């Protein structure tokens, strides 16, 4: 009866930095994934463990929409079994990921003359992230032998680092808004379905 509010996610006014990705869960509604493919000309629209053409035929208990901003160079890392600072320290998808990665270039919104440095990504972590983990900690990273808890030595870094989005940047350095729809399927009944 009710159509799933995809406009709230893809058409949001503000977007989160990748280290603090936003999540909105979708249920008790109906989703046409073909209407959303052509909803806007998307940079990337790929899926894993499922295929885009069949998307309306499936049915899921819950659907989670995760949104954030990264470089175009780093859309490759938003995929199962990928390595890199974004996948290791900011947003990790599991090896058995079933869902879709949708991204588009957002230079017109997120870049700015003189540079936009408001978006951040985690630069250091003592571990690689576990799937769908979200670390927004701000605590001084200690790299090397000498400790830094109060010592404040050289080899101790503030964990988050700002992106530098210039409008004249190459396409790889330009900001991309990314939406990842994870298709959770459980033993409980389904709540979201194609027509």
């Amino acid at each position, epitope marked *: 009866t009710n159509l799933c509010p995809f406009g709230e996610v893809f058409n949001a006014t503000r977007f989160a930095s990748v280290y603090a990705w936003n999540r909105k869960r979708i249920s008790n509604c109906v989703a046409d994934y073909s209407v959303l493919y052509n909803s806007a000309s998307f940079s990337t629209f790929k899926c894993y463990g499922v295929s885009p053409t069949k998307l309306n035929d499936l049915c899921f208990t819950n659907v989670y929409a995760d949104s954030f901003v990264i470089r175009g160079d780093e859309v490759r890392q938003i995929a199962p079994g990928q390595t890199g600072k974004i996948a290791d320290y900011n947003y990790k998808l599991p090896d058995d990921f079933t869902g879709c990665v949708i991204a588009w270039n957002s230079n017109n919104l997120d870049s700015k003359v003189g*540079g936009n*440095y408001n978006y951040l990504y985690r630069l250091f972590r003592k571990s690689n992230l576990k799937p769908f983990e979200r670390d927004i900690s701000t605590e001084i990273y200690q790299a090397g032998s000498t400790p830094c808890n109060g010592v*404040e*030595g*050289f080899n101790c870094y*503030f964990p988050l*680092q*700002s*992106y*530098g989005f210039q409008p004249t940047n190459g396409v790889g350095y330009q900001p991309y808004r990314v939406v990842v729809l994870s298709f959770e399927l459980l033993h409980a009944p389904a709540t979201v379905c194609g027509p």
Partner: nanobody
Amino acid sequence: QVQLVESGGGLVQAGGSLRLSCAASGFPVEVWRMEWYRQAPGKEREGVAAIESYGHGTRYADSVKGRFTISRDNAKNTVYLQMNSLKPEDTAVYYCNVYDDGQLAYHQGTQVTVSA
């Protein structure tokens, strides 16, 4: 258009004062961490001081803690390093670097000699 330029330095004696300035072009210096490095001729490069992005703190090596102080002038887009109570081992060439982590595309030094 991106570059860093070191100024200041020279000859001073044990107990003397000095201030080095690193003038950056092509980016605001407060958005990323800025660092000061030094390399004595025999030894390897050593990190001496660093000031994190925005107001997230300062970092000083044990070698120079309490004697050196790093600071940032957002108007002059310049990071300064004030060197007080200089000891003969502080002789080196002094370099500044941006911890841009590849968000830039840029990738000379100044000499400081302190006698006994």
